[model samples]
Target: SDGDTAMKAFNDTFWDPNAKMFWKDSKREKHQDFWVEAELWELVMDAYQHTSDPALKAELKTQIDDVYDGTVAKYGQDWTNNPFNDDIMWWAMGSARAYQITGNPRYLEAARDHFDFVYDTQWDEEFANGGIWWLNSDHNTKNACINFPAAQAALYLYDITKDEHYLNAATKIFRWGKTMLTDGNGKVFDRIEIEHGAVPDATHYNQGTYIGSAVGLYKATGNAVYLDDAVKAAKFTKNHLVDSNGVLNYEGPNGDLKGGKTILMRNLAHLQKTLDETGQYPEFSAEFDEWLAFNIEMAWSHQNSDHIVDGNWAGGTYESWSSAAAVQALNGI
Candidate 1:
């Protein structure tokens, strides 16, 4: 199976015992690198549910604790000073999911605080007129990179807390996205610059998070418009956001863009799963399976003997973030 093969490649190569975290590549040069930490651990927690191997389960638990503690030690558990809201949201996403998996009250407590903190500080009402800033230092670029995930994270917080404020925040983000970022077509633009309006570059994961936000809101409110908005993003990404050969399009060799496709796929899976559970599936499940299947095959084809998969899913030497996010799509199904 693609999942099994990719997971094996992942565990054998990416884990770093010294840091109790993952390295950026097969080189193993970086320790506890901030970029991949959240997704890497998120993947690990998911693995614990599927893997019965005692050694692996034990390893996952230790790394989860160690990484969380280490991150707090390094980042001071104060997300206020962190310029990168996306980075904070990544960790929050993982923490919220971690609570879901482990029922750890600490995960819940820290996650709720972090979510509120970031939401309170970063999302700007005056700058672009709406949407969250990517960073405090560089406030010019209001990116889908930050906003969509923040929206998803806000909804996740609502799920855990049953709080209306988180849901309101999520709606605020969605409204901003709807008004500013998206094309009338299915394409969600990449960012809205303070000086330049909407940037034309739309990453695959941007669309994913947009879809995920809609699915979240749709689940929360049962609004047909939100559900329809999600379907638009999902249907278009599945159809048009593919490579010339029709797998998910590669976003180039940049390490930062590595997780885009996998993130997109994971949320699409959520759309499929959520709809199916509601007995309202609109006939994308088989297609979604193939969408994942072919992409996993692409990822496996690119994986090194050392088990390091690349940003180029077809074949190139990539790194930790790509590999970690790759699992959400490849192994998660």
Candidate 2:
């Protein structure tokens, strides 16, 4: 079965009737009552696209409504107390994608609302940088995950509205992230400690976002620099993060040999996109197959009684952003 079929089965079996969301696991120790609702909405939209299932579409809309009412709107369009650091950006992404699929102006409006809020409130005025902040408050650190999602949100806004402001915002944020987060060799730092007065940290997810944002920016502007940056970052990730067997390792302070399947899948997705954009089709094909094989193996390893992935394992659960990564990777495969 395709990833969508597996996802559908997983959702059908694991979705909580009372909670109206997926559980963290079969044990029900935790509900999927978190910022990952945005990701779940995205997954639902992806599956709906493949199947054109009206029921799935309606379910996606319901989840979006619940997330807006329960979190995004309640939190006043900021990231305070949000589990996902990129909450606003993910909301914009899902909202825009949802709007595109359904032709719903309300979904676009929600995305625009969040986009504008980030521009007005969370932006660094002196720095002239408008990326989404890790926190909604005065904790002014910038993370690769946050900036990448912001870049995606900005690009989506521009694509929908064809507005220069959105494109300009995206360009600025992308440049800032590139300068601040990426090393000279294009290996991205995990987080820039803006508030705590600490050194930068590196992680596989940071590298994943670096390539993702760079590729998106390149697509938006047709800029060779962005493409070059993406290529370098992807190469660096493949060199340092990927094992000889193609499994990806988690790097930085918490670096571990027991690789997270989600991170590996994300890196592969970005790498494939980079190669495709740069006309390296042969490379893309090879890496794509490798990634698909690895992902299928990993997913099967995690599949439980309900066919949904278990929440805890040697790596981690398909919760938080990891689930979205898993879904995205599986779809890419």
Candidate 3:
């Protein structure tokens, strides 16, 4: 089966018609979390953007609105009730993309409203110069989950609204993240705090958002530096994070790490598209395509009997987070 088949099967396997959201498990017992729901919402956006088929395009467009309404039904339009800043930021990003596809003013308004509320409440000058905190209650820790995605969301808002405030906010937050959370080689650390300083371990989702934010800024401002930053990060992930076989190493078994590659695959595709559009890095463009092709094949080949794949690209039992990651990687190509 092709990528479309895999995606449709994923939808068939996990989407709960009544809830209008994806099931948290293959068994369809529980609902996905706020952030995962938003992430999967973008999965439809990716499919909608990638497809040219009139029928699939129309189906995905309707699905986009359904998912948005479903999310609003469960979580409501006003998201300030959520404590995790990153959680709100993820939904805001999804909503921004939905607005782009559907041109629904309510989608745009929801994104803008949530982003404004999150940035106002979560961003603080006191934290490591300036950055968004991960938790609303814990002021001590600032994680990559919030900062880079927040910057990415701000850029999307800027693109839609043409507001200087959003552009300025994007630049400001990206600068804070680049300074406080990322290394020279563009390895994005997970978090930093008042007592623990910066944690050195890098994760795929953060690295992906760093690439995403950098690409957005580069596109917006014509800054060669931002493109170079994205390229370096792309290189580091391919070289440092993969297994001896050149496949993306398993970061899974459960939880957030299981789904992190979904974000990475989406953003790497984003960067590759920009590279192709700009004609700056033909080598990196080809390199990314080759790597992405290889991993996408590996993941698809490993899918369970129902044609569902888990996070272990090498091969593993089915799980929702890992399966979302695989569906996302498959969607990338």
Candidate 4:
């Protein structure tokens, strides 16, 4: 798979050996922020699951451990120092996945600890009817970032521990998110603020995560409505968020938005995999396969001579964040 090529190019361009994580740019000057590193860590896990090649799988397995330890080296096991609730949730979710892959007790402990802390501190019953607050300090709005990923985190923990507590938490969070964040058709609003009400801004990551959480709940509970929700949101993303040529719309130059598609691609891949395994939603799976295939081709074609891609799937030069998202999309194949 050319995902190997994409992964190799990504490591060559962005890996910082001494830091044991990715650089913010190809210049190797700064390290990625907490959440970007977290997403790229998930990218490594993505490749690890996708590859059948023994040596590449071995390399990814080691890379996963390296990234996890590298993160702990920089940010410590207890992550309460972070104010952004969503950031902590992203790492928590990824840590749970690392535990799944590596059978590392430490990873599971870190995930459960961080998840408990975040949910305790940030989830407010009185706030916005229900949803995790975006920031620990600011109690204004409930963000799609935290609500959806935290729901997914709950599901991961439930899967690993067979704990009903995690499953119940997952169901609660997803119900709140579905009712508060999504339109009836599938367009996921970004957040709901005290002053502004529901913000109509739609980002790909939010859409992807809404689908991801729905798919997970469906798999866990045998609820066909959850699968219906996933497909509905996915349809909105594919139909409304693409360019004329069907490439994903460019999110931004350099911010969290640059890598939003990474989350989207990861979840869509998961949706497709679950659909394939369960023999459900065959037509939608085929549609998603074609859409993902075309976007993969377009993203790779935009890579620079050094094989670095910008945030713009349409075309641009080397940027670590954009290339990370591109690498993520390629791995989806």
Model 4 weakest 10-residue run by lDDT: 315-324
Q: After superposition, how far is residue 235 of candidate 3 from its true place, in Å?
A: 0.9
Q: After best superposition, candidate 4 residue 132: deviation in angstroms?
A: 0.8
The candidate that wins on lDDT is 4
Off by over 4 Å in 4: none
User: Which residue pairs of candidate 4 clash?
Assistant: none
lDDT tens per residue, model 2, 250-279: 332321212233443444565575676557
* lDDT ranking of the models: 4, 3, 1, 2
Report the error of model 1 at residue 235, Å.
2.4
Off by more than 4 A, model 1: 1-5, 49-58, 279-281, 301-308, 316-318
Q: lDDT of candidate 4 vs native?
A: 0.87
Superposed model 3: Cα runs more than 4 Å off: none
Clashing residue pairs, backbone N/CA/C < 3 A, model 2: none
lDDT of 4 by residue, 1-333 (tens): 778777888898888877789888877778889888999999999988877788999999999999988888988888888889998999999999999999989999989999999887788889677889999877888999999999999999999999999999999999998889889789999999998899988989999899899989998999899999998998999999988888898887538887798889888887887888887888888888899888888878877787777778786235677677778876773
What's the TM for model 1? 0.88
Residue-level lDDT tens digits of model 1 in 142-164: 88877888888888889988999
Model 1: lowest-lDDT 10 consecutive positions: 324-333
Q: What TM-score does candidate 3 get on C-alpha atoms?
A: 0.95
Alpha carbon lDDT of each predicted model = 0.74, 0.61, 0.85, 0.87
TM-score, predicted candidate 4 vs. hidden true structure: 0.96
